[PDB]
Amino acid sequence: SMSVKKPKRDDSKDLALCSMILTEMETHEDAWPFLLPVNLKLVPGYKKVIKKPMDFSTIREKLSSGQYPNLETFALDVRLVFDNCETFNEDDSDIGRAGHNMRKYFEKKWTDTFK
Structure with missing residues (x-):
């Protein structure tokens, strides 16, 4: 509250680290x-059904141009990609399976880098 703060978590490397994760997602064979x-x-x-389209190139441009205020808004857009997918x-399609695999891959890198 006013003049009462939890200790400052070091966020100075978050931009670099989100960029590294995103690079790993970009280079995965199922990307x-x-x-x-x-x-x-x-x-x-697609246009009617998917109210908020998101993709890795769009995340990369947002990342590079200071449009993520913090690491949680970055994770929200990555998850949006998989939620849309x-x-x-269908789960039993090449794309449906790709999306599950990528979400798994992301969530592990996320936990290991930040939790």
């Missing part, structure tokens, strides 16, 4: 559904 924004002209249904894709 291909997620590298670029879904083409809203060419994928019927589960909304639109």
